[PDB]
Amino acid sequence: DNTTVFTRILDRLLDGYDNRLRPGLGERVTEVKTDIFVTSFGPVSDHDMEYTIDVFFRQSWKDERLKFKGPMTVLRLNNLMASKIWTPDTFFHNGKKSVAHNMTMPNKLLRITEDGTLLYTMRLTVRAECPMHLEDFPMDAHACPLKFGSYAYTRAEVVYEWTREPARSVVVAEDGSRLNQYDLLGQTVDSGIVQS
């Protein structure tokens, strides 16, 4: 019985685990580490003032209720258990219609380490919008932003930080970029605070 051990370890891990409560509800705040890997900077459309992007969005937060002791020390879990534990919500402030792909199964991998550190990546195709200034047409240069923040959580409860050095977080593939008119130049990151 190779699976009878792991099934016990993975049922005891979910026993008494309430997915409605984020880790440390009265204790110290949680800290979600984020990263992005652009697969292909989609076709910018001049008419609609929108642009498409295809990212491998990633998240990594420290949850203490999930730690354990076992032989593997890394669990490569299926795509089903990702909905039974807590997962932070993250919408795009300027997304007209985003879609998450489920090609043959939902494209979400969950890696629960032995310490309690998670990794929860997705795959997204985002039709974000950006305002354009065409006063310098055709010789203009745009800056189309992408602003992803938390939702339902104030600053005192969930705080985002880039996973690696901020200059190297937003990585872009070499051949993935495709554009007819424009030509990608560089990436720039910046964290702020917005009140609503």
Epitope: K62, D115, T117, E161, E165, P166, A167, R168, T188, V189, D190, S191, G192
Partner: antibody
């Protein structure tokens, strides 16, 4: 919280010395560890960075190959090894942690190394 | 590599007067610039992280404000024990530090 380092080190040129800062009050596998050296009355300077979980280490190109940073996760300690010491290498060495927007919130006591 | 320029190099002010410091950054660093306070023969502490944010346990007389390249640390009612060295440091990329400003009373 509190960061403890080793005592003073006095060593002649052509010998390797090993400096260590021992963390306490927090698990090291959460945040990175930095190393800043300060000569007498000059601006702070960056040596290298270590990540205890993965193991990746990046160094300042002017110091690359001269100093190697290794960590012992089980003992919760970060080690700094110096090699090819020269007379002008005399300076104070600091251990640092990352936290709250990459700002080095906690700093060690500071170890004094004199090469002569 | 990113280089930080700091001015003035060294200035002295009286007790209870407004004081302005500046740290110029050649490349782009968007609101990831921290300010450290090193007293003589001690360990440098933290005052400002990000920009216009005060680390805990810090008096309110310290205020910051920054942009893509310009940055400014403005002390309020300078007390007696506010004589030390202030270092502007950025962490947008591999972290570097400024030359450092030395503050003496008069």
């Amino acid at each position: 919280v509190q960061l403890q380092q080793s005592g003073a080190e006095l060593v002649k040129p052509g010998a390797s010395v090993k400096l260590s800062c021992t963390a306490s009050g927090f698990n090291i596998k959460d945040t990175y560890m930095y190393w800043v050296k300060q000569r007498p009355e000059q601006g702070l300077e960056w040596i290298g960075r270590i990540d205890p979980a993965n193991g990746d280490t990046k160094y300042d190109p002017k110091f690359q190959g001269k100093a190697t940073i290794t960590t012992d996760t089980f003992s919760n300690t970060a080690y700094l090894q110096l090699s090819s010491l020269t007379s002008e290498d005399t300076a104070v060495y600091y251990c640092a942690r990352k936290g709250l927007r990459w700002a080095m919130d906690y700093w060690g006591q500071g170890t004094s190394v004199t090469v002569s | 590599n990113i280089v930080m320029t700091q001015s003035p190099k060294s200035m002295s002010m009286s007790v209870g007067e407004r004081v302005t410091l500046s740290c110029k950054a050649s490349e782009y660093v968007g609101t990831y610039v921290s300010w450290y306070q090193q007293k003589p023969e001690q360990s440098p502490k933290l005052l400002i992280y990000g920009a216009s944010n005060r680390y805990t346990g810090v008096p309110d007389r310290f205020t910051g404000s920054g942009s893509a390249t310009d940055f400014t640390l403005t002390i309020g009612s300078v007390q007696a024990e506010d004589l030390a060295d202030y270092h502007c440091g950025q962490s947008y990329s591999y972290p570097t530090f400024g030359a450092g400003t030395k503050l003496e009373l008069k």
